[PDB]
Structure 1
Amino acid sequence: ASMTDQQAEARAFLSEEMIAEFKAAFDMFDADGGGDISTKELGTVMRMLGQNPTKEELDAIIEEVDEDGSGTIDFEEFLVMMVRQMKEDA
């Protein structure tokens, strides 16, 4: 019954103690209660760096990490992102 191997793999790698470390910084990113992020809400935290983004450019940014269809970035997708680099060296 292995169809969603994508995120299923990141869940087994990251325990409850490690998942908690991201729990705090997860709601920070969203800022809409803490359930699922978006392309607009995300653009805000990204700006903190020191640049000037746009609505059109943000939709391409997520287009990278959004190979599902939903369009949002729920807790059951953010963990798959960070996990990708964790693998070996990346």
Structure 2
Amino acid sequence: MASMTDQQAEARSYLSEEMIAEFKAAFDMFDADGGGDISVKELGTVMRMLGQTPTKEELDAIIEEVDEDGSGTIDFEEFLVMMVRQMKEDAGGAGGKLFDLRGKFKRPPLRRVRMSADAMLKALLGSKHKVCMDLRANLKQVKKEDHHHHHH
């Protein structure tokens, strides 16, 4: 835990103390059994609950690209990286788009599309979301060396 060379450490460092305190409630979003690991099913349930409707392949992919253990599983730090992923690409991503083409007040609705991490957390947490969403990034990014090959 001292030799920070993983993606979880980054996630933990890209957030803020009070915001992490709010993320504590994230376990309640689905609530497996009061203490357990979450899989594509459980996760897919919560995310489809916001109106979106993807495939298991989508769920696995987003977890796999961050899963260093080679097993998509959500967990203490594994959960954290998930939440940061949406805000990460929204702040500094390449190709990632919320499909928003109107940055105004009379803008389109939820549309059941990939919206901001803020909007989703507001729905997932059930309006408990009040912390300031600050993703520590800038106008700098590059290609990652992360590319896995395995099918389960």
**Percent sequence identity over aligned pairs:** 95
Q: After the TM superposition, which of the residue ranges 52-61 and 34-43 deviates more from structure 2?
A: 52-61
Mark the structure with the bigger radius of gyration: 2
2:8–2:77 Cα contact (<8 Å) kept: yes
Counterpart contact for 2:64–2:70, Cα < 8 Å? no
Structure 1 unaligned blocks of 5 or more? none
**Does the CA contact (< 8 Å) of 1:27 and 1:34 recur in 2?**
no
- TM-score normalised by L of structure 2: 0.43
User: Retained in 2: the 8 A contact 1:38–1:73?
Assistant: yes
Question: Structure 2: 5+ residue runs without aligned partners?
Answer: 90-152
Q: Could you tell me the TM-score, scaled by structure 1's length?
A: 0.62
Q: Which has the higher helix share?
A: 1
More displaced, 73-82 or 25-34?
25-34
CA–CA distance in structure 1, aligned partners of residues 29 and 78 of structure 2: 16
- Asked if structure 2 preserves the Cα contact closer than 8 Å seen for 1:30 and 1:42, the reply is no
**How far apart in 1 are the matches of 2:56 and 2:88?**
31
Task: Specify whether residues 32 and 4 from structure 1 end up closer, same or farther in structure 2 by C-alpha distance, changes over 3 A only.
Answer: farther
Q: What root-mean-square deviation, in Å, do the aligned CA atoms of Structure 1 and Structure 2 show?
A: 3.2
More strand by share: 1
Q: CA deviation at 1:57?
A: 5.2
1:40 to partner: Cα distance: 1.0
- Asked if structure 1 preserves the Cα contact closer than 8 Å seen for 2:63 and 2:82, the reply is no
Relative to 1, partners in 2 of residues 1:80 and 1:50: Cα closer, same or farther, differing over 3 Å?
closer
Deviates more, 1:18-27 or 1:48-57: 48-57
The whole-number CA distance in structure 2 between the counterparts of 1:39 and 1:87 is: 21
* Structure 1 residue 42 displacement after superposition: 0.8
